[PDB]
Structure 1
């Protein structure tokens, strides 16, 4: 029920719908500008990125990292927890089917109250556009106002 702004590159800039995850209150409230990274392994973030020696920590003076993550195989909350542990500043979950947006919900059966990073589900189309812009060498910048 919210949106987001891809600010770069020109080929895909614009305002896109998205569905904010229904878990965690972001610690540093306000507006967040990031650079989008699509991981080369563990793209569904159901296992820890440490096992892969993969980190999304940004170097001093560079944009915080927004990790693009594919839907599948594990709970949304676990993906947010795993990506948070790898140091992403936010998580975008590309939907697996082309369909209207759904709201990522919490499960029940805990780390849940320890999830802090902004989370959102985007459409498969925007997910595919971002990946193709990145594949072609353009960094994909993005701003979140939630």
Structure 2
């Protein structure tokens, strides 16, 4: 399981370094990092359907942090969740595992080349911690670290 470090920068309650598992699609900024804010939509939480019907966009306003969308595993292909979040303007997708278990690699089921959004899966533990912080009205900000992540050919 190929992993990279993830750093929650806020709120203070859950700040720290965690691991995430990089999916076999999307394009991390290898050698670099990406800071964003995490959002867990109230609707279409598995990103199996189009966000446009919901009039939901994750395009962040100028000067604000890029939006990372927290998405639940289940019901559809991981690649489709990425494609759909990408269409909705998300800067990255974090797929929270539906069961508590070691990290797994999100595999693909040409068109894979069209998926560019950094895509990673996080544990149910971390997913639930983030949801709790957001539920308390806290912004959850996060730095994705690929500084030492080297891609395969």
Structure 2: 5+ residue stretches without partners: 147-153
Q: List structure 1 segments (4+ residues) > 3 angstroms apart after TM superposition.
A: 26-29
Q: Deviations over 1:18-67 (max 9, x none)?
A: 10111133478721000000001000000110011100010010000000
Say whether 1:137 aligns with 2:115: no
CA contact (8 A) 1:27 1:116 kept: no
- 1:90 Cα deviation after fit: 0.2
Structure 1: 5+ residue stretches without partners: none
Indicate the residue corresponding to 2:127 in structure 1: 127
**Closer/same/farther in 2, CA of residues 8 and 27 from structure 1, 3 Å limit:** closer
The alignment's TM-score, normalised by the length of structure 1, stands at: 0.94
Q: Deviations over 1:79-130 (max 9, x none)?
A: 00000000000000000000000000011xx532100111100000100000
Rounded to whole Å, the distance in 2 between the matches of 1:129 and 1:102 is 19
**Closer/same/farther in 2, CA of residues 29 and 59 from structure 1, 3 Å limit:** farther
Matches within 5 A, 1:1-146: 1-26=3-28, 30-107=32-109, 110-146=110-146
